[PDB]
Amino acid sequence: SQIRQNYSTEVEAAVNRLVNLHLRASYTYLSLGFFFDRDDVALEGVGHFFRELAEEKREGAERLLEFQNDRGGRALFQDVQKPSQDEWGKTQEAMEAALAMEKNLNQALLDLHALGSARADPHLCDFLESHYLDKEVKLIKKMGNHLTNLRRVASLGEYLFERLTLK
Amino acid sequence: SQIRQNYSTEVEAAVNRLVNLHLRASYTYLSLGFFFDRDDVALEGVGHFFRELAEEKREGAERLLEFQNDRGGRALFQDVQKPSQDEWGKTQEAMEAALAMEKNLNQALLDLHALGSARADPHLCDFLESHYLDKEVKLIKKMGNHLTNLRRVASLGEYLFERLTLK
Amino acid sequence: SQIRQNYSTEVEAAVNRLVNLHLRASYTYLSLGFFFDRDDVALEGVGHFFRELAEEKREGAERLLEFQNDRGGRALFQDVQKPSQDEWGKTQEAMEAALAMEKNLNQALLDLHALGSARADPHLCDFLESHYLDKEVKLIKKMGNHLTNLRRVASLGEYLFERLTLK
Amino acid sequence: SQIRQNYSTEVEAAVNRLVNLHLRASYTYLSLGFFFDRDDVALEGVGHFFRELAEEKREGAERLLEFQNDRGGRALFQDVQKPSQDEWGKTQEAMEAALAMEKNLNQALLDLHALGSARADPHLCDFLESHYLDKEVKLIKKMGNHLTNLRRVASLGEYLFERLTLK
Amino acid sequence: SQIRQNYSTEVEAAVNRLVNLHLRASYTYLSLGFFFDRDDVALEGVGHFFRELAEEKREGAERLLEFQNDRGGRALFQDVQKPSQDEWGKTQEAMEAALAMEKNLNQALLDLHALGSARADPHLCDFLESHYLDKEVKLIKKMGNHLTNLRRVASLGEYLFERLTLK
Amino acid sequence: SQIRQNYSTEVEAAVNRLVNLHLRASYTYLSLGFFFDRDDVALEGVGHFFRELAEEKREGAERLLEFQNDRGGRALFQDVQKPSQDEWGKTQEAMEAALAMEKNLNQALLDLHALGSARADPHLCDFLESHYLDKEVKLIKKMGNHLTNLRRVASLGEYLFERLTLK
């Protein structure tokens, strides 16, 4: 690439894997969102919460793809694997699955940051700190707050959480 | 399902496959869009044209998933296979691949309409006619117009088409 | 903590100490501010300068406490020790005490950044760079400018500096 | 002091102690506020209620410090002792601790008013009646109302009180 | 310096050299800009593109000089060497010279970031990441896009690129 | 040049030297401006006065370069020599250096006007009278006024001049 500079092949490949992980998370949120809109589940606020996250994760993938081109690497796409479950249980179980998925994604982002540090790629490190790491910390904190309230109301409480916290 | 009425299992399954086909098309458009934004390709208008289509195809998938729930069927997700190519060639070759992909998607929509006719599901037939069939005819006509102009300008002509038609 | 990730106990404890150091600085600025409003001191602009800083330091403490919760650590409060002096002298002596206090606070922030680097906590490092390190550099530069002007006018000059620089 | 008039040393010293008591209360409210924002507590409305009170108590301290200077006394600061607890329990227990703290602060304000009466300092007496005594009565009434409602809903009820009264 | 803290002499000197390199780049862009406005060259959009960059590079130098003073170092100026060429050829050759100049400047910025990392100067590292590194990546990507389009249109194509891309 | 008319090679060369002299003056003003913003100098109004002049001198150079192209001559750049001093002393000494620099630049402009008169180039003569000669007379008068006031206040007076005249 005529523009490539200080951009390792190791980081280029890890960026492509992180795009895939964000698309996988977005797809899982799409499945969560539509599950909560089933007529036999019907928790609109829960469905909306996860659909918004499907958009956020997709946007995270697209920003990584732009970064790949901006640094001269080559975007390479892999299959987006289907989500881990077809049915997601009650709100608390779904929210627990989302928290585990975000902590996994956060660890992948931290791993890429450590790789960028090891390869002395400060532009990558700033990119992740500026657009990913605090977004993950804030989202994971929000999910932890929601789980604490779902445990507090534990059913009628699940209905009230969807109505009064979500929305 | 307490709400299910006049909704065959055959149509429910075909709806799930059509969701997957729309996500596959959206993913291919995502790859096309970022390929045209590579610094060694750099045709902004072409990249934008395909990124807009990635959004449209995804929206088509989401509308089908809502229809699935509205009729009482169960959304089931499968892997989204990676696009057929990693590199898409010049604008004309990419546009030819997009036209073939849309004609394939159109035939899948027509096949589902024929299935809905055979199963006497007028709500499905109206859904497809109202939100899918004319959108496909109009898009396929637009791509045919663009291919004719890309052949007309065939390089400097490719640059001028991106500047003056797309943009 | 269900949300804790990549957050060392060493950083958690240092965050609590840095909260205390910011509250100590805020309290010292509260004392400076009211000393300059005594009828036998009466330098309104000097009092205002330090009262604004009491607010800024408190805000710095509160932002650290939010960060502690956002990462899953536990806020632990210690006594806020009273300021080092009960009377602060003329403007130049007070400003010299403030500069020394800010350089001390800056070194504590730099020490926490070095700890975050050693523990590979990029979210902490970004947090400090984004909300603390440049604020300290800019404030310390401003205090150095003010000290140079207080030395330049050195009394009538002290009155004129309060009137014409503070303001 | 060139301005001092009808201002006893006994009142000057009691004003300094009351400043400290207000800062102690403000600090306790800061700790209460952040405890309720922990991810494993997560009662936003409760955290907000106490953070607002941390501001009010601090403002009460600052108004007393201004009064000290306005009458010619000398502000003297003491350490702000850390709050009585590191963890504050459920909403009702926290609110009970706040009520006890406000009744203690109210008694200190009443004691200072009695001292001002004994020393025939009507300006002090008006100051306290105008800016402190009714604020305390109204706040203590509000906390009593909240405790009655927390007992009424006694858990799901605690969640509903945070959602519907606090927010 | 009364304000200097955690600011190495090595970084102070490298900051002064980087100021000079930015002024050298600004001067080269001034020469490029006026060359394209010669009556026998006359590519207004090309001249404007480079004149805008002369301003950006100068601004980068001035921001570094402010940083030098903010950290307590001493600005030291050296001659601004004249640009490498007096005549810059066709648009593509000029754009190739600009890309090489920006990659050189980017490497100097990356070298200073590595020096700041080695000396544990996080304020310097944040300064560069926040105001220089992504600006360079984005500019270098833009120049790569422009070179690809100049090669695509390669004369009449050069005229059309100035008219339809620049503009 | 197809456009050149009544434009001597002697004037073309003198225009290039005058561009260089304006850039040299602009660079000296850049150094003056940042010296007065050092924390151990800290005369904001003085720094601003000289930074504004760095812009004006640069603009004078750019207008000459446009004139060179408008008449068909060829811009040729030389190194911009570093300023005569690294440190500029008190305000009066700096202002005396600026006055000497402007009188030198004014004499160079007058010399070019005399050359244009000798070569019967009225377009050059009008250009200089319209955009340079009165600007120099007015600036030199302003600097003389400022020096008289700096001598009048001669330290506290230097502070007051920066506060009340500059700013």
UniProtKB/Swiss-Prot annotation, chains A, B, C, D, E, F:
GO molecular function, one term: ferric iron binding
GO biological process: intracellular iron ion homeostasis; iron ion transport
Domain Ferritin-like diiron: 5-154
Gene3D superfamilies to which the protein is assigned, alphabetical: 1.20.1260.10
Keyword check for Iron: yes
GO cellular component: autolysosome; autophagosome; endocytic vesicle lumen; extracellular region; ferritin complex
CDD domains: Ferritin
Binding annotation for Fe cation: 52, 55-56, 59, 62
Cellular localisation: Cytoplasm; Cytoplasmic vesicle, Autophagosome; Autolysosome
Keyword list, A-Z: Cytoplasm, Cytoplasmic vesicle, Iron, Iron storage, Lysosome, Metal-binding
Any Pfam family: Ferritin
Domain of life: Eukaryota
Subunit annotation: Oligomer of 24 subunits. There are two types of subunits: L (light) chain and H (heavy) chain. The major chain can be light or heavy, depending on the species and tissue type. The functional molecule forms a roughly spherical shell with a diameter of 12 nm and contains a central cavity into which the insoluble mineral iron core is deposited. Interacts with NCOA4.
Function: Stores iron in a soluble, non-toxic, readily available form. Important for iron homeostasis. Iron is taken up in the ferrous form and deposited as ferric hydroxides after oxidation. Also plays a role in delivery of iron to cells. Mediates iron uptake in capsule cells of the developing kidney. Degraded to release iron upon autophagy activation by nutrient starvation.
Sequence similarity: Belongs to the ferritin family.
Protein name (record): Ferritin light chain 1
Species assigned in the record: Mus musculus (Mouse)
Gene, per the UniProt record: Ftl1
